[PDB]
Amino acid sequence: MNKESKDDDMSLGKFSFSHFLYYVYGLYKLFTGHGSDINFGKFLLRTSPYMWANLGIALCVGLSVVGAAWGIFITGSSMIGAGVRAPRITTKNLISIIFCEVVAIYGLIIAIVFSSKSNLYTGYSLFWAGITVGASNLICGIAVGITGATAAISFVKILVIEIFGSILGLLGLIVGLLMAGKASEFQ
């Protein structure tokens, strides 16, 4: 029902805040105010189906995107930070920057393959795929980044770890495929 239009507001109602973060009680009153709504209480009213679709696929890339843009983020200083001390061999440290982004390309891959009201399994089971590779990316951007920001100032003995954090991208992408593998096309 109406609950449709809210979650979008809910989702958006969040990202703004987390954005303005980069620029507590309110939780509890929700919980108690919720904790009562259950008990009152005498009869139960329970979850049920809606259409969904996209919200995963777009959330997938986006959630993934930041993972990159948050990866080059922590490194982007660190390279330049090394920088003026020894500006050359910036690019020898560049190999780090490339991974930090490629984990975004994972999930652009998603964006396509996910091209496509009974047996909702197509749509419904579509979603959690989007989120899973997305967050798997999201942190996959972290790991490569933090190593990189160390890699910059810190040779290849590093890069073992950076790639030891690369495969998270793949495995991150693999299951998103599998989890989508059985999914028929909706109208």
Binding site: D8, F15, H19, M51, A53, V61, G62, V66, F73
Partner: peptide, 25 residues
């Protein structure tokens, strides 16, 4: 519009990430 909603969030959040990167660097 779902896709439409998907559309914006995609670009927008990505952008929101993009900027977050741009400024720092």
């Amino acid at each position: 519009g779902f896709i439409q909603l998907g559309a914006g969030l995609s670009v927008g959040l990505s952008g929101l990430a993009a900027g977050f990167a741009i400024g720092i660097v």
